[PDB]
């Protein structure tokens, strides 16, 4: 994750593997 330029919904899908714990609010649209 940290300081690398991985882009589009593969970082939305990886956000559930990276932030991980809570199950999240995530409001800035959803990143298509």
């Amino acid at each position: 994750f940290v300081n690398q330029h991985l882009c589009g919904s593969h970082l939305v899908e990886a956000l559930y593997l990276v932030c991980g714990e809570r199950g999240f609010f995530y409001t800035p649209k959803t990143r298509r």
Partner: peptide, 21 residues
């Protein structure tokens, strides 16, 4: 938003906590 910021520039866990509530 966080992934737009990661596509253009540097990206940190502080920008995760900005939207990962």
């Amino acid at each position: 938003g966080i992934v737009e910021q990661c596509c253009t520039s540097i990206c940190s866990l502080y920008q995760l906590e900005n939207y990962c509530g």
